[PDB]
Symmetry: C3
Subunit: 217 residues, 3 copies
């Protein structure tokens, strides 16, 4: 069934699967991977590689853990950097970020392309242009930057951005978005260690919900 | 079409076969065609297929005709199974309708019904209800029977204007007795009869927290 | 030619916790909840409390077949738990989460339950460690009781008195299938309680029981 089956969430939408949920697709190397398809938002057909919903899961994790993915299909998760690379290595995927505060305000941001290099290249980010979005652009800042974890500092800071802002990211010096930060529940006094999108609700507010998803453009 | 003799026909068959846990399973409509449904194995004995569910306001139920046509939402949250599917699922033979409704105070309420069917789209997804049977809810969905289902981008109601808009939902609409796909307006709300409203559950000013609409061959 | 435990699944590259299907000693397929995230991962979860939305005060027929929702709380079923732990020694972990979001846990060298004929009798290994303390050893070598089938060592009915289902003795020091009484409660020992953890008056927010081949 490598040849019979679907390759992206967009294919699945095309075959009449209209409910968001966990489906299995086939990577370019025929590796089956079970992913979360968002069939409801902005046309549908999105593959979701990051989800924060309740802070039930700990996102302050080491390199090996971000490499392979972690969390629960039942809630919060990170698909894993190898998988994310695999899903974007060949061709041309757009990127949607979806955010929701505790007041119930939906914000979003969209990007013309999104790709991450392989581990040899430290999961480098190549971000396309900012298209539109109510959350403002807080990711172009992090273009062309390696991913870093607490136990592997690849940022452009003389210190450790992952430790300073309690997360994992394509930190530069340090950040303008921090979606793998701590689930601090709305306003917080600690400086920028939450689920923060600057242009969105700033350095001191942590969203209720965060989702990053890709669709083939 | 006619009852698939070759695999699990309904959530009921699943139960009889030893899937005791509530969850997304897959069945074969009389088409003998597959679809992946939510089976409620736990309630009023078990065996139910759920075509509608609200829980947490996460999803926007104020959608147009084409989107109710095919179903929307998420397997992990609120969802509508789509009217084509719902047709195909009930309008083969006899199948009961149960409704579960929970208030934000954390109680429980219901409303078994004899028989439930939606005619197709060709025929405006007209609802064929049957006799109320029992349930702490009252709303004996007598009205709405023989009524075309209505959205925002179409009309068809007992009221000149959009029943849809004026109340912000979708249902088989002079104007509405029970407004289940309405706006997840957490609790008692000043605005009138636009919330997630049973009628004799909590009137028009209490939108519930949790809602489910399911079916089992009667 | 396929997995027989959550541990196997971990070994093949399934890194996300979730519902997978495994194959039991007889090859009956069984869909279980794999915890791939906690303490090394590879745990099969047979009991889960999360929010109190499921009735746990249930009979023998229901505790035998299992009940609830993969979407939330559930009990895998006594038949299943025995099949899962029929032979090659699985260790048990017990994971507990209070209402201020604090974690306590407990871990046991081994865990096994007999079949229905021996009335799902508890066979438990040695306490190896855990912030929750030991509150299960006390129940070693006791049959399981529900409300409609009293097998305890009490002249009365422990299942009824503490609104639960357990290897009740006279009666319990843990009562994890107890009523979901959110937080501290005046009522005595009828919550999701763990005597050594938070005592007979604190009922937890999350509770999970899980097995992995030792
Ligand atoms: C992405 O960013 C890199 C540098 O950032 C690193 O690499 C990326 C992939 C991430 O993993 C980050 O975390 C890392 O921080 C840019 O590299 C620079 O590109 C510019 C072009 O604008 C180069 O500027 C030129 O360099 C010429 C000579 O380069 C050679 O010598 C230098 C040092 O002497 C050496 O570092 C380099 O490798 C070559 O050997 C020079 O003649 C020319 O006139 C101009 O100065 C700059 O040298 C590059 N630096 C590095 C570190 O290589 C990428 O350009 C950028 N890519 C994209 C797509 O934008
Ligand atoms: C959190 C993180 O990335 N650290 C993990 C920890 O969670 C646990 O999985 C451990 C097992 O020894 O391996 C790491 O140390
Ligand atoms: C709730 C419980 O455990 N009790 C059940 C009850 O709900 C019902 O299903 C009955 C048979 O009709 O079996 C028990 O007696
Ligand atoms: Ca650094
Ligand atoms: Ca009209
Ligand atoms: Ca007794």
């Amino acid at each position: 069934p490598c040849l019979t089956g679907p390759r992206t969430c967009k294919d699945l939408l095309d075959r009449g699967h209209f409910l968001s949920g966990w489906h299995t697709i086939y990577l370019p190397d025929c590796r089956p991977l079970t992913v979360l398809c968002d069939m409801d938002t902005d046309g549908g057909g999105w593959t979701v590689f990051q989800r924060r919903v309740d802070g039930s899961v700990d996102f302050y994790r080491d390199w090996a853990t971000y490499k392979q993915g972690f969390g629960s299909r039942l809630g919060e998760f990170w698909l894993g950097n190898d998988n994310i690379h695999a899903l974007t290595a060949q061709g041309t995927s757009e990127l949607r970020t979806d955010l929701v505060d505790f007041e119930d305000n939906y914000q979003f941001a969209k990007y013309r392309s999104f790709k991450v290099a392989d581990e040899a290249e430290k999961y480098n980010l190549v971000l396309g242009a900012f298209v539109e979005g109510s959350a403002g652009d807080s990711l172009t800042f992090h273009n062309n930057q390696s991913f870093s974890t607490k136990d592997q500092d690849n940022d452009l800071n003389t210190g450790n951005c992952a430790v300073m802002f309690q997360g994992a990211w394509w930190y530069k010096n340090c950040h303008t978005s921090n979606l793998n930060g701590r689930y601090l529940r709305g306003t917080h006094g600690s400086f920028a260690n939450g689920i923060n999108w600057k242009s969105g609700k700033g350095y001191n507010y942590s969203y209720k919900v965060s989702e990053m998803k890709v669709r083939p453009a």
